Symmetry: C3
């Protein structure tokens, strides 16, 4: 007689207890997702930093090497002054055309990566 309020309230209480179980699972899941995202952000910063260091050193050495090759070419055109220069002695499809200096443009790409990482410290 009353039983049709006891048993039905019973099924309510057991089911509410499941909802708290499901909520519990979910919470632990979310705290772990946040953990993993933090750890991913961290790997990104460190890799960007390692990579950019490597680019900085490649760039600086490239610029030094270029300055040396520029001077070598001069001192070869001088030693070949009798024989029309390199443009005339080694004979390529273009041969004598200048060497691009991309040190500033690469430094600017390093700057942009560094700017992007500063961003990770605010989000």
């Amino acid at each position: 007689e009353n039983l049709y309020f006891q048993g039905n309230m019973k099924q309510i209480e057991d089911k509410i207890e499941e909802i708290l179980s499901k909520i519990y699972h979910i919470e632990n899941e979310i705290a772990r997702i946040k953990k993993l995202i933090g750890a991913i952000a961290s790997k990104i910063i460190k890799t960007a930093n390692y990579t950019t260091n490597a680019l900085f050193l490649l760039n600086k050495e490239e610029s030094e090497i270029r300055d040396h090759v520029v001077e070598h070419e001069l001192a070869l055109n001088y030693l070949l002054a009798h024989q029309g220069g390199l443009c005339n002695v080694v004979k390529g499809p273009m041969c004598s055309s200048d060497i691009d200096d991309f040190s500033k443009n690469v430094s600017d790409m390093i700057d942009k990566v560094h700017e992007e990482m500063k961003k990770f410290y605010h989000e």
Copy 2:
């Protein structure tokens, strides 16, 4: 009688606690999606600057290489009587050629670019 009404109060209270928990959850999911997208965007932007830097190092390296190889020929000429370069400088591997990896590096840049294309499909 009051056992029924009182237990109904308890249940309604638990629903109130549950629905507020679910809300904070939904707020946490919204903050997480914001972060994952912001992260994706930094990866793409970073990777772009990076391969742009790689492109320009590789291009100039290959140009530098072209001139050095010509410079060796021009020097080997100017030193022919004394056995070219690899007799007047003396080294355990003087004559070892200079690798030209410019196409392998371009292939890598293509691969980074192809990986970043796939971000626009999620």
Copy 3:
């Protein structure tokens, strides 16, 4: 009177418990799509770092060889222009015949360190 002030309530309690089980179901779906998405981001980081380090590795190796050959040439051009004061007197530079930095080991160091970060993705 007496009988509805129980039944009506229980039905709205049930119907709310219905919507809760629903909102939960939808949350669990969003969580699964977030987890997959993090998984693809991590894979895209590992792959992109791998290609970038391979490019660095090749740029570095060839840069080293070039530098070795430029050093040779510097000595050769100092032998040829010697009676005229070497290369530093003839070329005229505020530094001119400066030494060339050799950062190959420092670059390889950075390569190692990236491989090291990427290793840890296999350990989580």
